[PDB]
Amino acid sequence: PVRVGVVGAGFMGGVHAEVVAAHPGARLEAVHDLDPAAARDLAERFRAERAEPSWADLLADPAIDLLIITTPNGLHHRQAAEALRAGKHVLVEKPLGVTPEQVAELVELAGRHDRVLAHGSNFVHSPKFVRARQLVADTEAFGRPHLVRVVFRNSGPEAAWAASKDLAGGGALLDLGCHAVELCRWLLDGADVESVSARLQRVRPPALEDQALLVMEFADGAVGQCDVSWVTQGGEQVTAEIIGTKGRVEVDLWTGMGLRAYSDKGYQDVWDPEQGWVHPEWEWIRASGYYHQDGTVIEAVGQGIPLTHGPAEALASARVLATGYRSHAEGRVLRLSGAPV
Amino acid sequence: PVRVGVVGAGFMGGVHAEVVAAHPGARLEAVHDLDPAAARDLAERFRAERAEPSWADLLADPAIDLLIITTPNGLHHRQAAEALRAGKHVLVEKPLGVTPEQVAELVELAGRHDRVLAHGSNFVHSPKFVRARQLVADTEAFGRPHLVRVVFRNSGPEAAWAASKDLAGGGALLDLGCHAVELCRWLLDGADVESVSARLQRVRPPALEDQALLVMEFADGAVGQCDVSWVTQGGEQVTAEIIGTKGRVEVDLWTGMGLRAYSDKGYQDVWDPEQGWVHPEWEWIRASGYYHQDGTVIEAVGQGIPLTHGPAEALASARVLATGYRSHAEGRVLRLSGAPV
Amino acid sequence: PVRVGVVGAGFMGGVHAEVVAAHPGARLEAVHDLDPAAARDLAERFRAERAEPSWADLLADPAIDLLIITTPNGLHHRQAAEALRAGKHVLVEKPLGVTPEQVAELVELAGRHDRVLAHGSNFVHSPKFVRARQLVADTEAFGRPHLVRVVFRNSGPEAAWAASKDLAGGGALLDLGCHAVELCRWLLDGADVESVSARLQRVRPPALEDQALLVMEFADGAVGQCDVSWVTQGGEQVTAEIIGTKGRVEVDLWTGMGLRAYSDKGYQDVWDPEQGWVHPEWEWIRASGYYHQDGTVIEAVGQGIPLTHGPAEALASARVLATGYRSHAEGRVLRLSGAPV
Amino acid sequence: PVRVGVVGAGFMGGVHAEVVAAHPGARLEAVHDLDPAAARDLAERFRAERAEPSWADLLADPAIDLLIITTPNGLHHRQAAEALRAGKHVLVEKPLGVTPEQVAELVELAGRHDRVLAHGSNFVHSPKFVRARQLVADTEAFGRPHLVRVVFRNSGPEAAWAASKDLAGGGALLDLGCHAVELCRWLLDGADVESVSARLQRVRPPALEDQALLVMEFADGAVGQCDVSWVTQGGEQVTAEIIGTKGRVEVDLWTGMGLRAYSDKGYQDVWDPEQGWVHPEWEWIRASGYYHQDGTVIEAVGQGIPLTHGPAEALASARVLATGYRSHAEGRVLRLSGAPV
Ligand SMILES: NC(=O)c1ccc[n+]([C@@H]2O[C@H](COP(=O)([O-])OP(=O)(O)OC[C@H]3O[C@@H](n4cnc5c(N)ncnc54)[C@H](O)[C@@H]3O)[C@@H](O)[C@H]2O)c1
Ligand SMILES: NC(=O)c1ccc[n+]([C@@H]2O[C@H](COP(=O)([O-])OP(=O)(O)OC[C@H]3O[C@@H](n4cnc5c(N)ncnc54)[C@H](O)[C@@H]3O)[C@@H](O)[C@H]2O)c1
Ligand SMILES: NC(=O)c1ccc[n+]([C@@H]2O[C@H](COP(=O)([O-])OP(=O)(O)OC[C@H]3O[C@@H](n4cnc5c(N)ncnc54)[C@H](O)[C@@H]3O)[C@@H](O)[C@H]2O)c1
């Protein structure tokens, strides 16, 4: 039985807490957060063994097998490192690291300590995305993939820390792009990136990029687009399309639920938009990959099953983003080495 | 651990076998089928303890706690009765009975033997339908429901037995209407039916009805429509709409998955239509309510938790259908007693 | 050049005025309305020769070739009769008459005076509905039609007169049903109605029906449904579906425009809902059949071309509704003669 | 009455012939084509005054006021020049020119001869796109536009000439991009482009690009994407999305018609895909902008009304594409001058 501690009790701490609570092969042992009231809140919502106000004490506890790190991005590196060094397995919310060396160093460290290190690329475990990838891999029907596009848009992060280079490590390209990139590669069966191009925008007044377009050229000839935004109203969008020589497939997470509803007021449990026509959500957490992701990690820690999607894939997406940032600066298409095509 | 035997190893035996095999609180003990090779095959797909070629022996086994009956409708009454008399809990695939007296007799019987009797109204446990119901019950946003419509259409049953009055008990009105009716009433919080009206059609040449419309007048003033068909091409449809004084809720099961795909050929894993634009499916079993339904039954047997949706609800739908059949024959709107409004 | 006068300057007077103004083969000569300020308004918006405050004077004018009657339903009979007797051709907004004898009498009268009498069954001239009918008539692809359903729903008429039996002649069944029925028959190439069944509802507090379901059985075996409502929020709905032995076709007028838009505020020229996700409209008038309808009438008056869709079709739909009203009262399925099937 | 000659009697000659034949303010005088049987055939479909086998004779005819040039792109420059020099007004199908100097030279020329020169940017006159633009220009609802994306994809041109650099002038970027670019700029009220970035692909084996992405940075801060493909199956796509600080607008031409249909066979009048679920089309020519475009040109020639959208706009799009081609070659983001940002 896999004994889990959740580091950081904000939005994603809550998502992971729910999943763990529900997983028969695991137990929610601890909730930690710099703000101890937020940790208590959550230990209670999900019947965690305790709320741990102390980081040192959390790491020292020999009962905890696995930590899930859902703190701001700037902190991932330091805490994942500390947690591995304390002998705990770690799942870190994306971005696993704010730079490729940070990621490389964590992967290296996990090995030293013979630990499972996983990252929060949930959409790659989303049952509907998994299905989508099967269909593109159906060569008779689909042919050779030549285009993949992933769109991730919302009205921006609300936590202050996401506004700071020091705390967030990056703007919308890192927050959302990391996922879009990870998905583009995964959808094409781990395609090798040969070049990267990107432009960034600051749409909102004063600074981190709110909107970005990143484009990858892959070995097989295909091209991948990542279009992400902090600055799009009317509801979170997560979509993808893959186009081949013979087929197409299209995936829609938040408006592909099969539910529409209308009211003047707003419906009790329907985030946003509240009013008029909305697309209520059902099993959002499952649909998004979290149950499956966490289950994989739990099965990995519990019975040394290898991860289907490992932190090497985080290193690749980090290199892509780093190269994307540099491409924007220089106004050029670059190879992963930083060199101008 | 709830020890389960699956009676009838066709299509739905397989669906239920899967769900049981995955449920940590249950074990798939036996698979029975008049055709023993079909039972062997399924015991193997899903690692059942054994294939039981004998019905008497199955009933006599004190190891089996619960039977799931997935045989043709004509056989439900007799086998559920026999199984209850042998002291086994029973989940019967809908229609629970081919007439209201058949249903009544089974409910009575289960009480006599202090047994859990459940029926296969899966859509009522479908997470997206559950969500839909919450929204209609949100009186501030939705207001008073005045119209509910459920549509169930396909290109007709593939098994020969579905062509026979003795084996099927009925045509499309019983095969599909049962579900549509059950949903209408459940979506309106168990609304009482005061009248019923129906017309049936025989679209295909020679006989059981292959298309039907049934309309219910409810106590609170609302009207429910059930539109079902065996004779609709281009893919199974299951949709629902609820309309209130203030709101609307629309639900779409088979084309509310958020996946579209196109090929000339057809995609290896995609039932039908095969070619051109299709709407592939993800977790169809979960989406349809089966994991949740069966979980409720397993929790009901395992720790005497009352069923959220019991066989009383099957008696009501049976009365509605019986009344529907009679209404068509007489050309009139009827009360549940058979009397002409 | 066809010289036109528009009787009644409310909503539909405005629609017809626009169409006429734009038609190269016609001229907008006069606008009449009991309220002369409303007539002046409209003569001005669309550059009509004059506003005519007097009905007697309007009828007497030898310049006017054609009147378009867009007054409340109770008045159609009397004014169409007066206008025909004055030698003017007439297009009457639906319902052409509030009863079948009223319709029969007008058709008879038009003949006496050798006049073109047309009615406002615009959707039957809607280019997208026309296309839909071609596809159903494509026997190789579609097969034999066995089901047709037309849905017409909105949040109800806003003019007071629509609340009065004397002024409106009927509730939602007559206001909306007339169209739905007309469309069902037309979509199936003028199918003969063998029976009719209907239930009506009063959803809003005190009285005319706000919501109705009417069902037709046709000669060829097909069944038609008309589902109409004054009591549906979130935006006017006009949809249709036809299902055959081999095909299906689905038609969507107001959310089949290919435009979505989102705002908090509301967008200047986007009726309703105003706020959140909306489906703006483009060329609504054309899309709805009015340009084509009126053009047919103009071509009929201008160069004695026969009408593609005549006022005989209004007599049939009147008989259907009359029989629908009676069916509801008696609780039975009826033949067009009033006789109980 | 504006007397028109249609140069080139292929697909688009036919589209334009139809529109002209229907326009009360114009007459279809002549059809010319190097292939005189193709010209005869079209003169007949649409009741043209004559088929003109000779180009010199066509230009010399003082009866012809306006030529519509629907020949392959390579020929536009030479024939528009010759036609202007002969004193004829000209509408040239896009691309107006195969390079900016070609376009510039034509604009210059038309001024010299006091002639109306228009180009075939039809989507810019598409009523549904016009509507879309109003909505984005609704600053209260929409805010400041920061992203515009136009997608144009199909399975590639069917005429042989489109395979040749000399005859086509270019691949998919010029054939489709021209329209996508033109739309991006028009949707943002004629926005000034400050930089351009592009990658091209050759998906099909041996050469002209069959897929492209082009990205524009505009003066006001906004970013435009043009995604075009010759190598996308399952049906022509033409879509657009505009995103602002407060709103979004989405437009869909070919699957925003509100018609769906299904058959096994294929429906007699439904291009492609033929089989399974399709999206039949209604008034495709109107919906695409051609009636309105040609009407503007006819009103411009007939009564010297300035064009709402002139050939200056074609020079801008040409500069963008030229810059796009160069950007791909150099691997860099460029200014319109060719200089590296
Ligand atoms: N998978 C996804 O789709 C997704 C979605 C949103 C966010 N995220 C990622 O998840 C992580 C957390 O995001 P979130 O939106 O829940 O943020 P949040 O602001 O809602 O939660 C963060 C919490 O951590 C706390 N915290 C701050 N410093 C800390 C410290 N030193 N030790 C412990 N706790 C500390 C804060 O008080 C806050 O309660 C981020 O890395 C982000 O990139 C992922
Ligand atoms: N709720 C739903 O979603 C849903 C969907 C489909 C079917 N069903 C229901 O499930 C039931 C079975 O449907 P199916 O599609 O699986 O039929 P099927 O043809 O696939 O399977 C029937 C099986 O039962 C076996 N069988 C027949 N008579 C038997 C007997 N007397 N004893 C033991 N085994 C016997 C057959 O050999 C066959 O293997 C039906 O009652 C149907 O109404 C429900
Ligand atoms: N085709 C459609 O889809 C559609 C839609 C709405 C209404 N209609 C029909 O069109 C007709 C008019 O509907 P509307 O919504 O414009 O109503 P409206 O109330 O907007 O307009 C009616 C106008 O006629 C005037 N009027 C009243 N008595 C009159 C008289 N004796 N002489 C002249 N004018 C008089 C009123 O002052 C008002 O200005 C109705 O018959 C209705 O059934 C059709």
Ligand SMILES: NC(=O)c1ccc[n+]([C@@H]2O[C@H](COP(=O)([O-])OP(=O)(O)OC[C@H]3O[C@@H](n4cnc5c(N)ncnc54)[C@H](O)[C@@H]3O)[C@@H](O)[C@H]2O)c1
């Ligand atoms: N705006 C749009 O929506 C759109 C759509 C499709 C095509 N187009 C454009 O329209 C133009 C024609 O396209 P199409 O698809 O009709 O090509 P097509 O193959 O259908 O027609 C070309 C015709 O021109 C004739 N022709 C060739 N050379 C000629 C010459 N030198 N003089 C006279 N006639 C000649 C050919 O015999 C043929 O009949 C192209 O420039 C293309 O870019 C525009």
